[PDB]
Subunit: 92 residues, 4 copies
Amino acid sequence: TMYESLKNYFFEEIKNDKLLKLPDDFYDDIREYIKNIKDDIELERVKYYFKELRKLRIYKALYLDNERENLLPEELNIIHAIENIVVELKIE
Amino acid sequence: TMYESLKNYFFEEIKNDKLLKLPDDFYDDIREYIKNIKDDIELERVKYYFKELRKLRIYKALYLDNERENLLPEELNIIHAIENIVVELKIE
Amino acid sequence: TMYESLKNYFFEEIKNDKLLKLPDDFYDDIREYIKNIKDDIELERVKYYFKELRKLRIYKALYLDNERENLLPEELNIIHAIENIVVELKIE
Amino acid sequence: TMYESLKNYFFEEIKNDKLLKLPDDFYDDIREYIKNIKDDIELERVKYYFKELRKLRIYKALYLDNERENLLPEELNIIHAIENIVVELKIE
């Protein structure tokens, strides 16, 4: 059931030029389902579409959709780590 | 001088299908130069080509170059955070 | 002026058994002041009391104050990384 | 068996003033065991002693042991996030 749900989100995302709004805690709900899961079969499929959906959304935020209201915080954090210069100050 | 150097790395990266080998501590050296810098002019240019080079390399690792020997550790860490399911276990 | 302000927060924190409420963006405001600063003298002092205040608050959250309403999100994130088992799932 | 092993490391750590050397990938091995585990009973015990050992080692690095050769990289990263001022530069 989770396998089919992530596919729909993936197939919806690949259809549109703009980033899609995801439910708050979309990825956290996937994580909580993972603790439940007891069958390697659906696990690899969930891992696959988790990877593919997130790869595509990162690409859209990087090059296609300047607007980022539909990025979840954990996705904006990845975009920021990619794009911004972070410098660490030490006592030395 | 740093402005022109990052451009060369950017223009070299956009030329080739595979990820390019970067010197160890390539980004850390950019960070240390930032502490030196005292002129907003070169700063924005360094920030721009830092962003653009890293965006492109992420894209190559995501979709173009399965091999990741030329990803620096901080870049592999971003790819991993994108692609892999991380679950946190709590006492609850 | 920032040097004296962090001291007060430090001397207030060492006085009480419970974690103190900090203003939202307390640390972010320190970061933004750092970009302003142009004098190594106050810089090392700000770095010192930044370190010492945060060390103490981590210790209080770890062993003294079970309540965490007064931890800022970036501090709770450090406590969580210390205390919780995080496992990364890969395709392999 | 993992339950008893973490206890020994915990009881050894509480005995000595200095940080103890841990095997490389000590925590990663605990993570890989977690994927194996199928019995909530040992799970909560492993989570408990994982928390307690790491809390104590953080405390030793913060206040007791200036030397950090025996901190594993993921522990040094937590110490650094506690102690050092990290500033993010944006295009704005």
